[PDB]
């Protein structure tokens, strides 16, 4: 295959290239991690069961160069960031988790939601 590029919608900027993507592809599908469990206040009381979505709605990328002014200045344990020219909520950083909509866990994530960003090929035109 060829290399792919992730351009921001309404910013039109290449946020992240290929040679990235810790994609974590298979879900768990067993009862404790493929299912979303909503506990209660006490006694591990399960009130809600949510089945996972089909495709993981994120892009798990490495810490990049243009996140360095946001990651160093006011470093915290969680937050969000933007396109560098339109200031819209594009992705967030979380050192905790936030598995995928489809679910595993990962490592500390730089989660980049597949809504309001899209994926392009960096190579030449398809010529249909």
């Amino acid at each position: 295959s060829k290399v792919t590029a992730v351009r921001c919608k309404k910013c039109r900027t290449k946020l992240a290239l290929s040679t990235s993507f810790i994609a974590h592809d298979p879900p768990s599908k067993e009862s404790s991690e493929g299912h979303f469990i909503k506990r209660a206040a006490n006694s591990h009381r399960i009130i809600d069961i949510q089945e996972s979505q089909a495709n993981c709605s994120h892009f798990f990328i490495e810490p990049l160069k243009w996140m360095q002014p946001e990651l160093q200045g006011k470093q915290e344990l969680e937050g969000k960031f933007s396109c560098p020219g339109c200031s819209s909520k594009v992705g967030g950083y979380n050192w905790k988790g936030s598995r995928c909509s489809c679910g595993k866990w990962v490592i500390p994530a730089i989660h980049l939601q597949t809504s309001k960003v899209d994926q392009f090929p960096l190579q030449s035109t398809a010529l249909p």
Binding site: A41, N42, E76, L77, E78, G79
Partner: protein
Amino acid sequence: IIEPSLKALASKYNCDKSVCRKCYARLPPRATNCRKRKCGHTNQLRPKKKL
């Protein structure tokens, strides 16, 4: 990002309250009776549900 030193400061006024079962009023946690007069000063109190 809440910095849970401040959440414990916030939980005292909102979460750490007791609820009357009858009149649903927001009562202090170590209180015995409801302060409202419309429910007859009842002693049937429950904790507020934690998130």
